[PDB]
């Protein structure tokens, strides 16, 4: 297969600013018929791929002219003159000159917005769950930016590395924030041996960890 390598791999851009993405092929994309079968596609979160550009620089008629493609041979570029909210997603290049057609691995465009502090909530395991022999402590960290966040759990003052599962949402279309859930799962008997459970978030919106906690005694 013809390798298609995209750069950069992720990109954060402010609405109204330009962006550029590069695609490099392991060999020339010129077909013997003289055309160069290189396309660019966008996939918005939870949707299908959409075609932006075909034959290197032709604009799909459903797509606005803020998108332009250039290049030749093995080197190709997509440019966005001016980024809009709707341009959030993953961009892919594609070649259909050589068999089998190949796609590049994708470039993720995120919308840069103002820093936003997470709203952090902590929840004790339900009694229902405890009857299964298991216990899950749940921590929500909602509507924050930038995405990078470190969440640490403590039990009676000590960091608990294992038993933690995290899930992140994709960037929100209305306010451009991210949210995350972190879950500490223990056995009921382990859960019932300790008093203080804490979720601590490190995030650039505070100079200390953002902390929520509860005590099993109540």
């Amino acid at each position: 297969d013809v390798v298609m390598t995209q750069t950069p791999i992720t990109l954060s851009v402010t609405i109204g600013q330009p962006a550029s993405i590069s695609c490099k092929s392991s060999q020339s994309l010129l077909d013997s018929d003289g055309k160069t079968y290189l396309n660019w596609l966008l996939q918005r979160p939870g949707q299908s791929p959409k075609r932006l550009i075909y034959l290197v620089s032709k604009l799909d008629s459903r797509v606005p002219d803020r998108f332009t493609g250039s290049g030749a041979g093995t080197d190709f570029t997509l440019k966005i003159s001016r980024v809009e909210a709707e341009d959030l997603g993953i961009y892919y290049c594609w070649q259909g000159t050589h068999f089998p057609q190949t796609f590049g691995g994708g470039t993720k465009l995120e919308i840069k917005r103002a820093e936003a502090a997470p709203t952090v909530s902590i929840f004790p395991p339900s009694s229902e769950q405890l009857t299964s022999g298991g216990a899950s402590v749940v921590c929500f960290l909602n509507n924050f930016y930038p995405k990078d966040i470190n969440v640490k759990w403590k039990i009676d003052g000590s960091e608990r590395q294992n038993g933690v599962l995290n899930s992140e949402t994709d960037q929100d279309s209305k306010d451009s924030t991210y949210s995350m859930s972190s879950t500490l799962t223990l056995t009921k008997d382990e859960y019932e041996r300790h008093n203080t459970y804490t979720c601590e978030a490190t995030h650039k919106t505070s100079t200390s960890p953002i902390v929520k906690s509860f005590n099993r005694n109540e």
């Binding site: 993953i90 892919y92 796609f103 929840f123 339900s126 749940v138 899930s167 992140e168 949402t169």
Partner: protein, 212 residues
Amino acid sequence: DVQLRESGPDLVTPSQSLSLTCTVTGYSITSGYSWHWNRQFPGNKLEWMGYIHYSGSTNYNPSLRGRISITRDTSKNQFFLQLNSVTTEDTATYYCARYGGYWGQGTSVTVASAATTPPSVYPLAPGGGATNSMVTLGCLVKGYFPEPVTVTWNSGSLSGGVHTFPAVLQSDLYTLSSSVTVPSSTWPSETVTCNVAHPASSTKVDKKIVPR
């Protein structure tokens, strides 16, 4: 006005065959173009699998042995994927497609020997207090298989301040959570309920979130 629509199973067992259907409308598959199956793996990478040409000939990616075939029913204007001997590596979103920028909505396929299993639904209610004008409640949905589950809150009348998180694997089954944020003036004085639907097991669970 070309549209493409994939359909077929959510879940296939390892070693079995996967069969999907693409129903094409607004254009006849015998009148031109090649008609393709592609797939997207977790991690977002895309592979072309094969096509059926309008003449009826077929071409397949070398990477899929002879374990892929594509056929068609020109009377119903449908073409079909069959992938045999499937493995965990074939777990993916499958898209039918045509040149000119036309893709189906995609259909997700998991390949596992794990059994369909209905969810437990646990309520998330806060410990012993804070002042603030908004409160966050949630639901924990645990130990179901396969994807998807739907979560709504009070039958959907609460949609505004909701976050439902992508499911994660946990002991070979899925666990997700959802949170909802409402005015403290309304809870606990009014009921908030999470409604959970797991279609694979034909289950709906309502869980009321009760204080303490």
